[PDB]
Amino acid sequence: MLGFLSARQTGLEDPLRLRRAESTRRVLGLELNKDRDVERIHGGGINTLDIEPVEGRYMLSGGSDGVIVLYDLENSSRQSYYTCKAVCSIGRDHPDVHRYSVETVQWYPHDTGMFTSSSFDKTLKVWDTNTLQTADVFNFEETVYSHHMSPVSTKHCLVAVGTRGPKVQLCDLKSGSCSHILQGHRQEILAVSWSPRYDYILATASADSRVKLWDVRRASGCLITLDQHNGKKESANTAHNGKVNGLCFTSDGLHLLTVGTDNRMRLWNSSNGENTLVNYGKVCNNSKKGLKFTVSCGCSSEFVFVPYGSTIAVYTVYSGEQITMLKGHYKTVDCCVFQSNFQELYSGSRDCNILAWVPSLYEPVPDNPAFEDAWSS
Amino acid sequence: FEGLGPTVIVCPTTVMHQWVKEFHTWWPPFRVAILHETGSYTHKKEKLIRDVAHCHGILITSYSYIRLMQDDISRYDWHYVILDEGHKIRNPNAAVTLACKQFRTPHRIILSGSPMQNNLRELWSLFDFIFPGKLGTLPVFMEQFSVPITMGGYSNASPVQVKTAYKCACVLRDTINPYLLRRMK
């Protein structure tokens, strides 16, 4: 610690070294709400979370009852153990409320004045953050399992939505569109995620055990249908061995992470599509819906936090070793988000509470009355 | 492929002679072959097709020929499909439309001075050729685009219906702009 500081002011080590080292140390020291608490307004289980792309201050949340609650995640008070209050909530009284369970929500990249929520009521809604009303409503024939917006594209505002139908739907915020549709899948599309490196590259995961790398501009099918055993190469080339219900690109976009109900997790090269043969052990996954997970950014070695039953598992992205299990929840956890600036984690589960995982090893120095054994003598 | 690969052009039989002339007065290096009963080999036609595919030349074919041999032409990996008077595939259920759409080439160009003449089904068939995904399947396009616009054209619809026709036309007008270059005189 001190050696990292001294090596910084002296100039032996580049200043990024201490930051990456201290960042990865915070992730390893993650523990429950030592100085935090999330205000509970979700009557049902919480399905999704998203931190704003800029300034990472307000966090959306979508419950199983349809209410969507926008949160505040910094200590406006002097005292510690602050409670993460909710600036606003779109509840039952709202005229434009999701009648049924809202599956995933997302902040629009490049500004915080608009956010999109998609529910099981077969609709994707565009919202105005300031006025808390809608601007565009996109109805769909089948239920909606996921939707993603490109976090890096500046030439378009396409939102990719995967429905229970076997064919991807590409809606454009600019104009209405809602007609561009990608064919090549066979069953329910449980996860869609754009590539942070390439603007027009999209990954779609569906129940036919196939993940396809698409190019939206491309007018002829898919580019790569990822296979498991890297044979010579569709109605074949199964990406997993069951139902692929997860998708998370790495920080730089060079590799793809997928989770299926085969209790297996795989890391895939983004360009060619060959799997990198990182085994990850057994990753428990019985979810029949979209499973949301995240990957750490700005650390020495990237981490991946994937829901694991009633716990969250932390793995090294490339090494594939199990770091620790964050046993905090009582029901199954379905969404986890990562606060890049502060190396904190927020977990939404089905016990109707968002848990905050904050780095430990910083404690007040006294001059603990509860920390003693009471054994008789 | 290196350079321009094998290219197939489908035009009405009254247009093939003009097309072969233009290639000879704007780019001599291109080798252009015309598929016809008269032909230029007085032998089996498969031979000519194979030769063209091999030399990465340009093959000109009548529309009725594409219908006759739909499993033979499409298997030779053509690099460009250019349709002159492209409104000949305006009916999606027509066999000529089915034969024309079987090409697997991402690059497909339609030359039609009057793309739409009757209805938006006419437009969808052409756009399903150049870009199959852009406008979705016909049942979705028929219900979500054509019905709301063809109902709002009558001067008897309620003021909500006419505004719906405008919005549907506006969405349809700007989902086709990058793929339709339409310049009037």
Partner: peptide, 26 residues
């Protein structure tokens, strides 16, 4: 006294969001 918007990280959800209301208020 505005709470959201601003603090630029293309279309900053004001030019684009007006288009949504310019076509859905019909």
């Amino acid at each position: 006294k505005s709470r959201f918007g601003k603090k630029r990280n293309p279309l900053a959800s004001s030019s684009l969001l007006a288009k949504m209301r310019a076509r859905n208020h019909l």
